Amino acid sequence: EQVQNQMNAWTKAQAKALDDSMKSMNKLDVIDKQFQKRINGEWVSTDFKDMPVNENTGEFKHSDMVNYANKKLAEIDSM
Amino acid sequence: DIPDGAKDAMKLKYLQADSKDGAFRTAIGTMVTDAGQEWSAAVINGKLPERTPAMDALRRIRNADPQLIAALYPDQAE
Numbered sequence: 001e002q003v004q005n006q007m008n009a010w011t012k013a014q015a016k017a018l019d020d021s022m023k024s025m026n027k028l029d030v031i032d033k034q035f036q037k038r039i040n041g042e043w044v045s046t047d048f049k050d051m052p053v054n055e056n057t058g059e060f061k062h063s064d065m066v067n068y069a070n071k072k073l074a075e076i077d078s079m
Numbered sequence: 080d081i082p083d084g085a086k087d088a089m090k091l092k093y094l095q096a097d098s099k100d101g102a103f104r105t106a107i108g109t110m111v112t113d114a115g116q117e118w119s120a121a122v123i124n125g126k127l128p129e130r131t132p133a134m135d136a137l138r139r140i141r142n143a144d145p146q147l148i149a150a151l152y153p154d155q156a157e
Binding site for chain 1: 108132
């Protein structure tokens with residue numbers, strides 16, 4: 001009944017680690033959706049400072065576009 | 080459930096009633112830049128591409144309200 005009390009905290013520290021790595025995937029998904037709405041012929045900006053933000057993503061940093069930019073090119077190279 | 084031509088009369092009220100960097104004049108600014116880049120590319124290469132969406136869209140929004148597109152971006156107006 002001490003190890004149970006330890007797991008109540010270790011699980012909280014694992015859910016706070018799948019919160020900061022699902023944010024960093026939400027941001028790439030929304031950046032892809034922005035690029036795709038811009039390509040298919042719709043007038044919405046694609047700067048990282050103009051994405052939408054909904055507490056599943058947080059504020060967008062610059063490095064969350066670099067990451068995306070090297071990941072479309074990586075995916076297009078593999079087709 | 081408003082007329083499809085009465086929606087412009089309000090999106091444009093927002094676009095007119097906006098600061099210079101607000102996210103309204105920054106999502107339309109992409110239309111202006113794509114049209115401007117298209118016109119420059121047309122001047123240089125020589126041919127006007129058969130697919131020019133940005134310039135046509137700016138032309139429709141100009142015909143919808145001329146005293147707005149002439150005021151915001153005063154070179155596409157000319």
